[PDB]
Design a protein around this ligand. Structure first.
Ligand SMILES: *[C@@H]1O[C@H](CO)[C@@H](O[C@@H]2O[C@H](CO)[C@@H](O)[C@H](O)[C@H]2NC(C)=O)[C@H](O)[C@H]1NC(C)=O
Ligand SMILES: *[C@@H]1O[C@H](CO)[C@@H](O[C@@H]2O[C@H](CO)[C@@H](O)[C@H](O)[C@H]2NC(C)=O)[C@H](O)[C@H]1NC(C)=O
Ligand SMILES: *[C@@H]1O[C@H](CO)[C@@H](O)[C@H](O)[C@H]1NC(C)=O
Ligand SMILES: *[C@@H]1O[C@H](CO)[C@@H](O)[C@H](O)[C@H]1NC(C)=O
Lengths: 99, 105
């Protein structure tokens, strides 16, 4: 009894084609990019993926911003707690504000 | 510009366009190694200046990031920062001193 506008577009010759890549296969691509970034760093973007611990490739990335790598190794727990709190704040911001 | 570490590029003229020939650097043959963030020596923590500590299973070497070139770990390619009770994963190894054989002889 409540007719939608989709049936009007549908009957007047205006259709919508489905995408080639479904939402279950975009998520596989993002999972592959996430598993390559954590376990290898930037080595999977050049050639083959080379394994490296996370606590050392974070020290590789402090050297790229002008900080010596002893700063991470002397403050690893604080940086890990700050990152976990930041992900929690992103979770709360996405679960609270819809704008 | 290409896949890998970019080195050069060369332009070639094409009809209604241009063609680039990107010369890149791609690593080929990799080997597994045992690594450590720091080395405890005389109550001091030694971090590498440029490179990463690797092991042969028995002995310890310092090696650059993108190529395998093992060197003996001395005081020239390492720097001291702090103690051994703050770094997680620090191993025990000796660090060579170049002044000691020159002062002995
Ligand atoms: C640098 O800033 C951080 C804040 O992210 C400080 O960490 C907090 O320190 C207080 C000390 O009273 C603790 O109560 C908090 O729990 C810490 N936050 C954490 C662990 O997420 C850190 O102390 C500062 N560094 C200093 C002052 O040297
Ligand atoms: C890993 O490489 C080192 C290289 O120093 C090997 O140690 C020995 O080192 C002495 C010099 O002090 C050489 O004269 C020996 O020939 C080396 N031994 C060998 C078997 O090459 C160490 O043995 C190597 N580890 C493994 C498991 O092969
Ligand atoms: C390193 O060890 C892993 C552990 O399973 C193995 O699969 C791999 O073939 C080894 N070699 C290289 C070059 O990664
Ligand atoms: C390194 O040596 C110190 C004292 O010489 C010792 O307390 C420590 O346990 C050693 N490290 C390991 C991994 O055994």
């Amino acid at each position: 009894a409540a007719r939608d506008l989709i049936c009007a577009q549908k009957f007047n010759g205006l259709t919508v084609l489905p995408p080639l890549l479904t939402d279950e296969m975009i998520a596989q691509y993002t999972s592959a990019l996430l598993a390559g970034t954590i376990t290898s760093g930037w080595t999977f973007g050049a050639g083959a993926a080379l394994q490296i611990p996370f606590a050392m490739q974070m020290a590789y990335r402090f050297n790229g911003i002008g900080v010596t790598q002893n700063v991470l190794y002397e403050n690893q727990k604080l940086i890990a707690n700050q990152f976990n709190s930041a992900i929690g704040k992103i979770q709360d911001s996405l679960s609270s504000t819809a704008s | 510009c290409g896949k890998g570490y970019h080195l050069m590029s060369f332009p070639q003229s094409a009809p209604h366009g241009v063609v680039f020939l990107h010369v890149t650097y791609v690593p080929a043959q990799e080997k597994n190694f045992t690594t450590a963030p720091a080395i405890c020596h005389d109550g001091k923590a030694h971090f590498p200046r440029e490179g990463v500590f690797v092991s042969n299973g028995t002995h310890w070497f310092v090696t650059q990031r993108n190529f395998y070139e093992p060197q003996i770990i001395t005081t020239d390619n390492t720097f001291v920062s702090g103690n051994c009770d703050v770094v997680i994963g620090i191993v025990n190894n000796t660090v060579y001193d170049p002044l000691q054989p020159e002062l002995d002889s």
